[PDB]
């Protein structure tokens with residue numbers, strides 16, 4: 002046909018991914034920043050006992 | 058896609074794909090162009 | 104042993120509450136001690152040291168193996184043109200016409216001779232498996248299982264409270280991977296497909312595509 | 325006899341130097357057979373007696389239950405599948421698994437249901453065997469006898485030690501016969517009573533040597 | 544050399560670090576290879592040396608008994624079957640199992656006769672080995688001597704310690720070659736000399752990797 | 763166009779994961795009021 | 798006898814303070830039926846005592862005990878009755894050749 | 910309670926007379942839903958679909 006499309010306007014794809022690299026973008030960027038948060042979780046407090054939130 | 062490959066899809070599968078904007082390619086059949094039988098034909102799905 | 108929740112007398116055990124007293128030589132000292140020695144194979148405290156240093160090597164190879172068996176089939180499902188994306192067919196890539204292409208790419212590794220692969224492997228593994236026994240360039244006198252130094256460049260084993268915690272994570276990730284790599288073995292023998300294909304076949308219909316689909320498969324006569 | 329040094333042995337009369345030192349004869353079934361030295365540590369030899377007796381009590385339940393569905397099929401009871409290594413697959417049958425032949429009985433259809441019920445039920449009673457449960461808490465790990473000897477047969481400890489030997493010798497035979505049933509199904513392909521019937525029919529040709537060229541690698 | 548710490552190791556220079564401490568070098572064939580730890584109990588370890596040597600001696604009679612009917616069929620002697628893993632089927636043939644090819648020889652017909660002979664015969668000899676009897680009573684079960692050393696070579700323990708090392712290393716080659724013969728018969732289906740000859744035809748193409756795709760699963 | 767879509771999905775998921783793990787990184791304790 | 802827990806730890810008879818004494822379950826909750834309106838002869842001495850006697854049929858603990866022998870026999874027969882009525886009808890409806898598993902016509906099924 | 914309440918709709922559609930299917934062949938009427946879709950790729954495909 003005349004031009005080139007991505008062809009996903011009304012297809013209902015999961016999180017709008019149609020190249021599998023887009024799903025690894027979703028997992029890579031979430032996973033990179035989950036890991037930065039997880040390693041940095043030692044500076045956030047060890048809320049280990051049961052009554053250890055901001056409560057009233 | 059051929060004509061039968063289009064008609065073997067439901068409406069929600071062909072929707073939003075751009076397949077609906079295309080003519081069916083004629084994958085079977087040859088370029089001999091003579092075994093077309095002479096005479097009149099009413100021409101649908103043109 | 105510290106108050107690290109995974110060590111000592113009040114530690115989690117392999118039957119939960121139904122385990123009773125653990126064996127007397129499983130004092131909660133070494134990581135992953137769920138008190139599971141029902142066969143009594145490690146009652147000798149010297150064989151128990153050998154089985155510990157044999158479990159963890161099995162664990163570290165199976166953790167590499169389980170990641171190494173999912174990863175070419177996961178990318179193979181996403182259009183990467185492997186010769187055989189399935190792991191138990193991945194050996195036969197050396198026997199096809201173009202040889203063995205890493206990532207299915209012809210101008211990557213491009214192995215053609217399997218005798219060159221094995222001849223390289225025996226020389227390279229034999230050098231480094233012996234380094235694991237004694238000495239070596241990356242560390243000479245270290246622990247047999249947790250050498251550190253050059254094998255801990257990020258320093259993630261400095262705090263011995265953290266280090267005794269991460270050893271529990273290593274053995275539980277390892278025992279899960281050994282138990283899953285055994286799953287890769289059996290469910291490739293029984294079914295004949297890749298483990299990510301067995302997963303997606305199970306997800307498409309869990310009522311029929313469970314393991315009872317192949318229960319009559321090895322029936323005699 | 326069966327205890328002390330002056331007991332029966334695994335080589336009989338030619339066994340006076342064959343038996344090791346630690347196999348004294350204070351445990352039942354001790355004919356002094358540890359030819360590979362596996363049970364030299366008494367901590368592991370304690371574990372292997374638990375492994376032997378529980379295997380014996382599962383094989384006696386095995387060898388009786390691998391046989392009575394095939395006898396009653398010779399007596400005229402329709403099971404669907406009466407041969408023991410085909411009797412698991414009859415839950416996938418069109419009417420499911422009726423117990424003897426009655427659809428008024430169990431009539432199970434779902435294999436994942438009867439397995440998950442089993443994992444919950446057997447996960448508790450095998451846990452009761454280890455730590456204790458409703459039938460006892462601090463008994464012998466192999467011979468509880470409080471709720472598990474209701475008929476009073478664990479009395480008179482002289483003849484009760486004989487019953488421990490009668491337990492393991494019936495049990496070792498059943499373990500030796502369950503290892504039978506597994507191999508006489510892989511090799512032959514027929515039921516063990518069917519293996520019995522044609523050897524009683526013609527003992528000359530219907531033996532294990534008629535199947536000796538089955539596992540030949542021909543390539 | 545061959546005893547004490549002067550013995551050579553199973554990993555060469557890489558085993559100078561850690562051998563098992565109980566493997567001191569006071570037994571023949573000790574290269575310090577117990578990475579699994581199966582013999583830290585010396586009562587278990589004395590039973591494993593008995594298992595290793597009897598496995599070694601039966602493999603030496605095995606690897607010679609598997610290699611001799613093939614090397615004599617290559618000369619031109621007519622055999623019922625040259626290869627060892629099809630060598631039991633001749634008693635089910637027409638003329639039965641002739642020894643080389645002749646009829647004044649053994650001429651085996653019944654498998655039940657030749658097995659029940661062996662069961663009572665090896666029942667006596669193996670029980671005599673475990674206990675003692677008509678060829679020695681208080682002798683060493685590993686190395687008896689006397690009637691089991693007729694040629695007078697079990698003397699002068701400086702050269703008898705070396706014959707112990709020559710005993711087990713010839714055996715450890717033979718056990719590795721029977722498990723050699725066992726695997727190459729299953730994977731290929733041809734005899735070991737028949738596997739030796741076509742590896743000498745084209746060594747690059749005909750090796751073990753040519754059969755690597757054989758046991759693949761596909762359903 | 764796909765190069766733009768990959769880039770926007772790296773960018774948007776960078777800022778969404780800053781949002782999510784920011785409130786998981788002990789937001790309710792970042793008060794001036796003591797208890 | 799030593800009675801380890803059915804699922805986990807220590808089991809047996811945890812509290813009989815729901816069945817005997819002033820504190821116990823009743824046939825009406827405590828905001829509708831206090832502990833002074835319990836009849837004086839209904840105390841926490843018999844099993845299953847909920848303070849339930851609105852029609853004054855109990856008089857004293859010796860008359861209640863001789864209705865207790867009427868209650869517990871009527872209990873133990875109806876428990877054998879309830880299993881004897883459902884199970885033969887359930888087997889007949891699912892395939893057993895009982896011919897009369899329904900309870901109210903079993904007698905006339907077997908007459909002559 | 911919400912889970913067992915959600916099984917009331919499933920039991921009423923599968924067993925207790927069915928529910929109204931406006932997409933039924935022959936026009937819309939009450940249809941017993943004998944084959945409900947338990948495929949996770951279909952069920953969780955609505956949730957990750959764009960709005």
Ligand code: CHL
Pocket residue numbers: 115116117118119120121137278442443447448451
């Ligand atoms: C209180 C309940 C409880 C029960 C019942 C169990 C039970 C078990 N845990 Mg434990 N756990 C429990 C609580 C807990 N566990 C753990 C932590 C662990 C760990 C880390 C591990 C275990 C493991 C085990 C297993 C150990 C022994 C074994 O392999 O059984 C042997 C017997 C069976 C498995 C029964 C067989 C099942 C099935 C019914 C048979 C199926 C039949 C087939 C059709 C036959 C096949 C056909 C043939 C022809 C091929 C066992 C399944 C180990 C494991 O997973 O090994 C497998 C293990 O590594 N548990 C924790 C956290 C502290 C618990 C918390 O309360």
Ligand code: CHL
Pocket residue numbers: 190191192193194195196197198217220221224288291292752755756757758759760
């Ligand atoms: C981790 C060790 C390892 C394992 C488990 C395998 C497994 C396999 N390789 Mg293999 N390889 C391994 C290392 C290596 N291979 C190769 C080179 C090849 C080639 C060229 C080929 C194979 C093939 C195969 C498969 C044969 C099909 C089969 O037998 O189905 C039955 C078995 C299974 C389905 C899996 C069961 C695994 C196994 C029985 C249990 C694992 C425990 C082992 C007993 C331990 C053995 C390892 C020892 C030596 C340390 C099989 C899955 C062939 C293939 O891909 O065919 C399709 C093939 O052509 N391999 C090299 C380079 C020299 C290796 C280096 O170490």
Ligand code: CHL
Pocket residue numbers: 332333334335336337338355496661662665666667670
């Ligand atoms: C002096 C005569 C005498 C002999 C020779 C034996 C010998 C034996 N008794 Mg003993 N007993 C004897 C007297 C007595 N026993 C007992 C009481 C017992 C008991 C309770 C038990 C034994 C058992 C055993 C066996 C233990 C060793 C074994 O398992 O090897 C087994 C292996 C072999 C013998 C070698 C291989 C078998 C065969 C000859 C070769 C066939 C080769 C195949 C064709 C190979 C093909 C397969 C391929 C694929 C590999 C062994 C056969 C045990 C047993 O039953 O074990 C099975 C046992 O439980 N005995 C009493 C009563 C006091 C005796 C008194 O006379």
Ligand SMILES: CCCCCCCCCCCCCCCCCC(=O)OC[C@H](CO[C@@H]1O[C@H](CO[C@H]2O[C@H](CO)[C@H](O)[C@H](O)[C@H]2O)[C@H](O)[C@H](O)[C@H]1O)OC(=O)CCCCCCCCCCCCCCCCC
Pocket residue numbers: 015016018024025027028029031032033035039042043046047048265268786
């Ligand atoms: C088309 C597809 C589209 C994409 C899919 C879209 C749908 C995805 C939805 C998935 C579900 C998301 C839910 C995540 C919940 C996270 C909640 C959380 O904050 O979770 C918080 C918890 C915190 O855990 C606890 O964290 C603690 C922190 O300890 C630290 O601090 C302690 C003191 O506080 C001690 O000092 C300790 O030593 C120190 O380590 C401890 O370590 C505990 O052991 C630990 O259990 O995290 C945990 O439990 C585990 C968290 C879950 C696992 C996260 C995995 C992330 C992805 C991995 C894959 C990445 C791939 C990368 C690819 C690279 C190549 C491109």
Ligand code: CLA
Pocket residue numbers: 164167168170171172174175185186187188193194196204205206207211212
């Ligand atoms: C237990 C560990 C283990 C083992 C034994 C294997 C074994 C195997 N893998 Mg797997 N794998 C594993 C773990 C493992 N893997 C893990 C953990 C991962 C995730 C990262 C992978 C990911 C993976 C992929 C993606 C692929 C394999 C492939 C293979 C096969 C070929 C091996 C090969 O090419 O090596 C040689 C590999 C290397 C030396 C490392 C990669 C080097 C690349 C080519 C980059 C080159 C480096 C540098 C940038 C360029 C140098 C330039 C040069 C001129 C100097 C073989 C079956 C290939 C295959 O076809 O299998 C189906 C394949 O494509 N593996």
Ligand code: CLA
Pocket residue numbers: 826827828829
């Ligand atoms: C969410 C609802 C809820 C909750 C948590 C409670 C909780 C309680 N009530 Mg209240 N109550 C409720 C609803 C509720 N009630 C309603 C609807 C009524 C009117 C019938 C009452 C009337 C009532 C009285 C009159 C008394 C209590 C009392 C009590 C206390 C315990 C005794 C008891 O079991 O109640 C007794 C109630 C029942 C036995 C009703 C039967 C309930 C069973 C479990 C069947 C439930 C069916 C189903 C699961 C729920 C309906 C399904 C659907 C329609 C939603 C306790 C604090 C007592 C108290 O506080 O003493 C000081 C007391 O005297 N309640």
Ligand SMILES: CC1=C[C@H](O)CC(C)(C)[C@H]1/C=C/C(C)=C/C=C/C(C)=C/C=C/C=C(C)/C=C/C=C(C)/C=C/C1=C(C)C[C@H](O)CC1(C)C
Pocket residue numbers: 139140141142143144160161162164165167168169170171172189190191193194281282284285
């Ligand atoms: C504890 C106890 C106790 C009591 O008392 C007794 C008893 C019971 C005995 C015990 C138990 C034990 C057990 C469980 C065991 C198991 C193990 C295992 C499974 C291992 C694995 C193990 C496993 C392993 C190592 C594995 C490894 C793997 C690997 C490397 C892989 C590789 C690969 C890859 C990558 C890919 C390609 O393509 C192919 C291959 C080549 C294939």
